[PDB]
Amino acid sequence: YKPELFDRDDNAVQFAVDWVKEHGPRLVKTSVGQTFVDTKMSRLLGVPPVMVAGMTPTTVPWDFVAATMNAGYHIE
Amino acid sequence: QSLRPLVLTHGSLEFSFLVPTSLHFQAAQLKDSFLATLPQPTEELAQDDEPSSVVELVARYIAFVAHEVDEGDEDAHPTNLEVLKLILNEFERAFMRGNDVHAIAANVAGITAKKIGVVRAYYAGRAAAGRAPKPYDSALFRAAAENNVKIYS
Amino acid sequence: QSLRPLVLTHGSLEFSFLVPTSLHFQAAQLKDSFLATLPQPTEELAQDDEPSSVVELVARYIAFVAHEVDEGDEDAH
Amino acid sequence: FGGSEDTYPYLTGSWSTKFGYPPMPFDGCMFGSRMMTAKEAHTSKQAKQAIVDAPGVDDDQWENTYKRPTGGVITVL
Ligand SMILES: Cc1cc2nc3c(=O)[nH]c(=O)nc-3n(C[C@H](O)[C@H](O)[C@H](O)COP(=O)(O)O)c2cc1C
């Protein structure tokens, strides 16, 4: 509003965000040369932002789940 | 040589003041009839469209005095212009701290109405002592001319 | 240089006053103890043998003060 | 989803431009039906077979499940 046109503090200016800027995909590499598609998800979880969703019949048995986490991916 | 303690007292909020020894009853008078302009104090810390902060006690007083300057009270015009200069200075000193009245009204008790009440109490004592707003440019237009932001109308 | 607003307030009648800056608390004092000499104000606009007009607020005060002049209050004459 | 090629667009925020709106990035992507044919999945042999053998359908006529044997999948209560 009005007071955002007459301010003296350095922090007084706002920039409406472009979700492309803020949440755009990225790439990054480790100190041991892995590559991670950088997103909020992958950075949170700590693995590729591609994830196998939990599914009753198939995603139930402890094999497919532990084998998929050994394959370095987030599964439910 | 010339120091006189003036207190703006009300409910649970106060503001202290420094006055010339000479101009201390002109400033006592504006304070006196001004503490009757306000409704009976509330220890519940607020009233609807009455004081909400200490920033409002001074703001309400700045427009109270600046109104009695332009009001047809003669023989007492030179003396009111001085009470005015002090309150304006004490306000830009402590309350605004150099910053514009709008961005400093943006931090008082939200009624979306009293935030206006402070901003007009200022440009009422601003013009009643004849001072024309110093040509600052906002952090916005500053960074617009510094080509960070592109402002359209 | 020297102007001080003194108000004689009561019920529904008031009188405004101009006082020297110097002699403003002597005039505040006589006004103060004088607004206690009067009985509780009446919004019915009159009391028996109490104020009836604004001409009586000042008249009552003139004799109030002039009495404390001839009264033995020293150092303040 | 079943690949990085179709995933990519939402992973970007490019899908949303086709609908007259600014780019809208997703923070990842999720896979379900796809992984069913993983060799480390318990899905039976002839099952996984019959799964692949389902000719998918585009986002176009997906709602057609409700009425017909659309693609290889139908909807049921
Ligand atoms: C066989 C099967 C079992 C499923 N079980 C669950 C479940 O227990 N909880 C849940 O929130 N979603 C469940 N889902 C749905 C997925 O979690 C996911 O939202 C969906 O399958 C993704 O759509 P897609 O198969 O087209 O990739 C299941 C899907 C299938 C095909």
Please answer whether residues B17 and B86 qualify as being in contact, where contact means their C-beta atoms are separated by less than 8 angstroms.
Answer: yes
3-class DSSP state of D67: coil
Distances from the Cα of A24 to the Cαs of A37, B78, B124, in angstroms?
10, 64, 49
How many whole angstroms separate alpha carbon C46 and alpha carbon D5? 96
Bridge partners of C17? C6
- What region, left, alpha or beta, does residue A23 occupy, with left being phi > 0 and alpha being psi -120 to 50 degrees? alpha
3-state DSSP assignment of residue C17: strand
Q: Is A13 exposed, middle or buried (0-12, 13-18, 19+ CB in 10 A)?
A: middle
**CB hemisphere CA count around B64 (13 angstroms):** 19
Q: Is the dihedral of CA B49, B51, B53, B57 positive or negative?
A: positive
Q: Which of C33, C28, C29, C3 is nearest to C18 (CA)?
A: C3
**Which of B138, B148, B149 is closest, CB to CB, to A7?**
B138
Atom of ligand 1 nearest to the CA of D34: 27
Beta-carbon-side half-sphere exposure of residue D6 (alpha carbons within 13 Å): 8
Resolution in A: 3.1
Record: contact A7-B105, CB cut-off 8 A: no
Q: How far is D32 from chain A (nearest CA, A)?
A: 5
| 3-state helix, strand and coil shares in percent for chain C, rounded to the nearest 5 | 45, 20, 40
Q: Which two tokens stand for residue B78?
A: 């030179």
d(CA B76, CA A24): 67
Is C60 in CB contact (< 8 Å) with chain B? Answer: no
Partners of D35 on chain A (C-beta within 8 Å) are 52, 58, 68
User: Which two tokens mark B95?
Assistant: 């309350």
Q: Do A7 and B136 touch (CB under 8 A)?
A: no
Q: Tell me, what amino acid is at B49?
A: D
User: Could you please report the per-residue DSSP string of B31-62?
Assistant: HHHHTTTS-S--TTS--TTS--SHHHHHHHHH
Between the CA of D41 and the centroid of ligand 1 the distance, in Å, is 14
| Closest approach of D31 to chain A, Cα-based (Å) | 5
Contact B47, B39 (CB under 8 A): yes
Owner of token pair 């961005």: B103
Contact D31 A51 (CB under 8 A): yes
Main-chain phi, psi angles of B53, to 5 degrees: -140, 180
With beta carbons less than 8 A apart as the criterion, state whether D28 and A41 touch. yes
- Contact state of B139 with A2 under an 8 Å Cβ cutoff: no
Cα–Cα distances in angstroms (integers) from residue D30 to residues A41, A52, A62, D49, in the given order: 11, 6, 20, 22
Nearest residue to B117 via CA among B68, B66, B59: B59
E strand or H helix at C65:
helix C54-70
Does residue A62 belong to the interface with chain D, where contact is any CB pair within 8 Å? Answer: no
Method: X-ray
Backbone angles phi, psi at B102, to 5 degrees: -75, -50
Q: Which residues, in sequence order, are bridge partners of residue C7?
A: C16
Q: What DSSP string describes B83-132?
A: HHHHHHHHIIIIISTTS-HHHHHTTS---SSHHHHHHHHHHHHTTTTT--
**β pairing state of C13-19 and C4-10:** antiparallel
| Chain D residues with beta carbon closer than 8 angstroms to that of A24 | 12-13, 25
Q: Are B107 and B95 in contact (CB under 8 A)?
A: no
Q: What is the CA radius of gyration of chain D?
A: 15
Amino acid at position B12, single letter? S
- 3-class secondary structure, D23: coil
CB B26 within 8 A of CB B80: yes
**CB-based contact A36:A13 (threshold 8 Å):** no
Which positions in chain D touch A57 (Cβ < 8 Å)?
Answer: 42-43
Distance CA C13, CA B79 (A): 29
Q: Does residue D37's CB lie within 6 angstroms of at least one atom of ligand 1? A: no
- SS3 for D5? helix
**Distance in Å from the first CA to the final CA of chain C:** 24
What tokens appear for B62 in the block? 């700045």
Count how many Cα atoms sit within 13 Å of the Cα of residue A20 in the half-sphere of its side chain: 10
Closest CA to B139 of B89, B103, B94, B87: B103
* Spatial CA neighbour of A42 closest among A70, A73, A68: A73
Report DSSP state, residue C12: T
- The A50-52 sheet, strands edge to edge: A74-75, A50-52, D29-31
Rounded CA-CA distance C66/D76 in Å is 108
Cβ(A52)–Cβ(A64) below 8 Å: no
Closest C-alpha among D59, D56, D10, D58 to residue D34 = D56
Cβ neighbour number for residue B133 with a 10 Å cutoff: 12
| Alpha-carbon span D62 to A50, nearest angstrom | 24
One-letter amino acid identity for B82? E
Q: How far is B29 from chain A (nearest CA, A)?
A: 34
Kindly write down the DSSP assignment for every residue of A19-75, as one continuous string: HHHHH--EEEE-TT--EEEE-HHHHHHTS-SEEEPP-TTTT-SHHHHHHHHHTT-EE
Closest by Cβ to A4, choosing from B101, B140, B143: B140
Q: Please name the residues in contact with C65: beta carbons below 8 A apart, sequence gap of 6 or more.
A: C30, C34
Residue A29 pairs with which residues in a beta bridge? A35
Distance CA B53, CA B37 (A): 16
Rounded CA gap, D42 and A12, in Å? Answer: 58
